[PDB]
Amino acid sequence: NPIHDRTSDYHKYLKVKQSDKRYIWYNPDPKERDSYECGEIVSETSDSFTFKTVDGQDRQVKKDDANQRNPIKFDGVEDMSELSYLNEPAVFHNLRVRYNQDLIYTYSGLFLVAVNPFKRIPIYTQEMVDIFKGRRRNEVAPHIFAISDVAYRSMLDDRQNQSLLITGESGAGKTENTKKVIQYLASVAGRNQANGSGVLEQQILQANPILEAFGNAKTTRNNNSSRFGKFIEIQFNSAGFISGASIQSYLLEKSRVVFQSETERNYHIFYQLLAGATAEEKKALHLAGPESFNYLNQSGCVDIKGVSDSEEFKITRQAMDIVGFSQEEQMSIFKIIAGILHLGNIKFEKGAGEGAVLKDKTALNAASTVFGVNPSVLEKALMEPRILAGLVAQHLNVEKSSSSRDALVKALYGRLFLWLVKKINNVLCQERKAYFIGVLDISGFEIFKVNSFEQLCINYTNEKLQQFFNHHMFKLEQEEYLKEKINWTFIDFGLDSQATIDLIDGRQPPGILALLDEQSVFPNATDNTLITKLHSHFSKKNAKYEEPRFSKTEFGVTHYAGQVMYEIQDWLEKNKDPLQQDLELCFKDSSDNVVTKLFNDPNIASRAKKGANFITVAAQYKEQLASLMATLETTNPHFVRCIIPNNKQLPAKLEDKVVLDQLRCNGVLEGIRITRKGFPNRIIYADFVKRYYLLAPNVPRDAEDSQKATDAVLKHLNIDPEQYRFGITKIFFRAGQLARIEEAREQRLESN
Ligand SMILES: Nc1ncnc2c1ncn2[C@@H]1O[C@H](COP(=O)(O)OP(=O)(O)O)[C@@H](O)[C@H]1O
Ligand SMILES: Cc1ccc2c(c1)C(=O)[C@]1(O)CCN(c3ccccc3)C1=N2
């Protein structure tokens, strides 16, 4: 039995190897709430603690705001819910104790938390794989394999699709753990020797460098940030063999193509192409350095420390070779990327009149060449599009025409992104599936210095997914209480998120997105009109809304992860998404095979179209979110949280400020908040008696009636009866009660 043999590798790499004072976690600087020091408690009141700081000073904290340290027996628990003092620095502390012993996987209730070790740990060998084949969560130690295996067994046993919601930015090990999930499924889903899903495993993983190049960018927070969300399906036939894979992509931050904030970058692919292309490629596409393109030079950043964009281009090209893109398709792909940049170098100049003119036509001709369109047709389609009056030319002014040029750049880039996913799906999905195990990968919760419409949609997606988690926790907790016949009554945890979701997207009262859709069609609405309408509806009316005293262009939303303030500039223009038909007819006529598909395929083109009208981005956004949540509610969900230990790519250096910030955003701390309100610590009686038979007189270590023996210990210790409940198999304890009993045990054996 490797699981029970303590000489085994399983116990060496996945299990834990092992004073009287009381300490408390505290913040030396209260403004830095995630940086903690340990302090000794010295005095005690009815309402407070007094503790010594590391420098020897004395401090008072009210007992209701104190983050007590857990007794050492709690150090290394496989589930955070096993901690008695369940608070933020105590949870981080448990993570540190396990990280320094190379235990990178820890449960937090339903969550599997995975911290990137920045070093190879030998826990993914085939012997390891064998350990987890067929095992349930509580039979083995925390491991990504355990989540994969539980999901696989339930898929066949319940004949139900499964979802795996996973969070983590570049550097947290999310890509690695997703690859581990795929390879574990592939290992057990096939025959032990003759499984034949080797090519598909290669193509799924090689799909990632491609969408990373076109969909990831450098933000102020991360060098490789996913500006789109995706759902990856591991598909199975009815017998449980891997049958294929699919990728579903959600809205992309196409506004990033035309605009980047200071010190940020456009999507990687532009810098890869300009840096990695051959001399004959550059001339053919009329390329220059990033400095020479307005779409790449407005930010002051064109390179990433320690990232070679030419080397990255060869990796992306190689990836495209592998997933099936032909040389003709790859060259058309970069013609489009090259064309987009050329489009952005067009300078529309103010003519002597209302309409705009184009003095220099160099950029227009360079774009028409690589796109395969007629420069004159494009020129008029941009500056003099035709509308209807039972077709009427309409001369446009400068920014009216620059904005339509931008709209073409966004539509071109966005449709190209959808086409890449469709092409990758072509080699990944060649069989109708029976079941799927789906990996959800959305842009994580975001707080920039200036947060705009995109951030409200991103954080709203996380807000609804955190509620999805909270409701699932609720039903599993109810199941646990009645199976134990614990008389405790809690309301649905999902409803704590409901105020914030109603504020963003409710129907009556109308939420922010509905008020935005309304203002977008009101003739003379501005952004000032929009935010005023927002304040009128919500300031001092929705409890999660805030009208700031300081600024007149910002509104605040209180998410599960904290408060975020959104600047309202350009929300109406961002919500409106037109493309003039003259532009679309001009590119339907193109001589390039890939470009034509972008405007002729009713799936790539005609995306969220509405009978000769384009719907709003908020409308497009709600459509995708509602369909995702519908798919998700049919599945059995599992949750994985990937964490960056630090920002220095360093092994064995876990930093509280870095880690804690992520656990707030990814929902783990929200789950902690709910767990600590109830009865987290649940002990089988015989175990409680065995540990604490010596705190009460005349209690045998192995009592026949442990229920009675536990009541003896609790009564003798004068434990507050409000702090525990008696189950049929276990005793339920409130936060802190088990720690005090543990302390009492320490002192008594201290004295011995
Ligand atoms: N569990 C792990 N064990 C060892 N190395 C890891 C693990 N997870 C991630 N890494 C390493 O850390 C880096 C970041 O991984 P990851 O975040 O998954 O990739 P990306 O940055 O592309 O998202 C990679 O170079 C990988 O080698
Ligand atoms: C399930 C779902 C549905 C819609 C989504 C997302 C996920 C995202 O994560 C994003 O892909 C992150 C970028 N983004 C976005 C960009 C511009 C405007 C609105 C949303 C997203 N919308």
Provide an overview of this structure.
With 752 residues, the protein is an alpha+beta fold. Among the domains are: 453-574, Methane Monooxygenase Hydroxylase, Chain G, domain 1, CATH 1.20.58; 681-751, Methane Monooxygenase Hydroxylase, Chain G, domain 1 (Up-down Bundle). The chain is 44% helix and 15% strand. The protein contains 28 helices and 24 strands. Strands 6-7-21-8-17-11-12 form a seven-stranded mixed beta sheet, with helices on both faces. Strand 2 (37-44) and strand 3 form a beta hairpin. Helix 6 packs across helix 8, helix 6 crosses helix 11 (309-323) and helix 21 (581-588) crosses helix 22. It is globular and about 100 Å long. The two termini are 37 Å apart. Adenosine-5'-diphosphate binds next to helix 5.
Q: What is the fold-level CATH name, i.e. the topology of the domain at 453-574?
A: Methane Monooxygenase Hydroxylase, Chain G, domain 1
Q: Supply the number of helical segments.
A: 28
The rounded distance between the terminal residues' Cα atoms is 37 Å
Strand pairing plus helix content: what structural class?
alpha+beta
Rg over CA atoms, rounded to whole Å, is 29 Å
Shape: globular
Biggest β-sheet description: 7 strands, mixed
| Overall CATH class of the domain at 453-574 | Mainly Alpha
The largest beta-sheet arranges its strands as 6-7-21-8-17-11-12
List ligands, each type once.
adenosine-5'-diphosphate, the ligand Cc1ccc2c(c1)C(=O)[C@]1(O)CCN(c3ccccc3)C1=N2
- For the record, the CATH architecture of the domain at 453-574 stands as Up-down Bundle
Domain Myosin motor: 75-746
Family: Belongs to the TRAFAC class myosin-kinesin ATPase superfamily. Myosin family.
Binding site for ATP: 168-175
Organism: Dictyostelium discoideum
